[PDB]
Design a protein around this nucleic acid. Structure first.
Lengths: 177, 178
DNA sequence: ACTAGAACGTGTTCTAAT
DNA sequence: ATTAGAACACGTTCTAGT
């Protein structure tokens, strides 16, 4: 949990982190900069987040939970996949920071990276049924795998956004056949 | 291409990368150590490979090429065979897998041509396993590659066991073939 | 516990000298 | 084009003070 002061500090830290990530991407999210923008000390920043990976991944978790607050299965899956497709193109640098930290994480951040993962799959399952079944969760997991792979292909400028939408529609079509 | 001594320098660099990564993993393959083991200066190492990511992904491409130089009844059984080879080699040298895989996913646009070079190969290996593969077999192969990378990351992060990865990959295979 | 600043490790670049 | 090494940039840790 934590006190109100600690909650304020944390919020300021993650807000600064997502700001600098937005303007400059992963390499711009520097710990001295994130600490300076949140008006914290660096040792405070590392007290609240043990590594840069933990920081960006926790920001990704907060953002995806916030997005979690607010027809045919291919239609609802196309709606979610298009929402996250346009959301990927919305801020490419922020997506670069959060995604790259998500995949570069080591075992020390496993728990964090797991939560995010388990939540995202959950959304993909909640976007297929208005409670889901077992097979819906499985297809959701495979879909999320293809979305991560194609997201990495786009962020590294080896696949266009049209290519991402095409290959993920190919994945959903391959699963719903 | 380069001179003959330049080719030998590149090979020695990549062999040093493979050895250090095998013995210690991603944090162990350090540029000074790689340069010293390869008997080159760090500036030379950076002339041959512009970044640590380019270095490790290049070793990855070399390895998967040598594997390309070298399987069942159903394409279900052939796909399961290649998946099993990938799992067994994965646990065979987990620190080398951690090094090259984390360099692969952490990679930059600077190394796009490298990351694209490996991916298209691994896809070409999953497709040619099911096969002259169809375009449908190629799309299935690509989805399989994606779930294999996801579960590979989960296993290297100690958030999935080997049996979890095997179960999820076979599950994906059944969801894709039938 | 928060702040300020020093300091250490490692990826990456720069210098001097061939 | 290569080498030995210094120097720089950023993640990370540690010390002293409030």
């Amino acid at each position: 949990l934590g006190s109100e002061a600690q909650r304020e500090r944390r919020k300021r830290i993650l807000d600064a982190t997502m700001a600098i990530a937005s303007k400059g991407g992963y390499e711009a999210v520097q710990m001295r900069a994130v600490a300076d923008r949140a008006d914290v000390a660096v040792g405070t920043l590392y007290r609240y987040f043990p590594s840069k990976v933990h920081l960006l991944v926790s920001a990704l978790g907060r953002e995806f939970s916030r997005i979690d607050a607010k027809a045919t299965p291919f239609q609802r899956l196309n709606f979610m996949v298009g929402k996250l497709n346009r959301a990927m193109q919305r801020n490419p640098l922020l997506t670069e920071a959060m995604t790259r930290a998500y995949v570069f994480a080591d075992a020390s951040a496993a728990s964090e990276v797991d939560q995010v993962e388990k939540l995202i799959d959950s959304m993909f399952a909640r976007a297929m049924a208005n409670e889901p079944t077992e097979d819906q969760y499985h297809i959701a997991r495979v879909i999320s795998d293809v979305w991560l792979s194609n997201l990495l292909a786009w962020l590294t400028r080896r696949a266009s956004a049209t290519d991402v939408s095409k290959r993920l529609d190919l994945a959903v079509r391959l699963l719903i056949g």
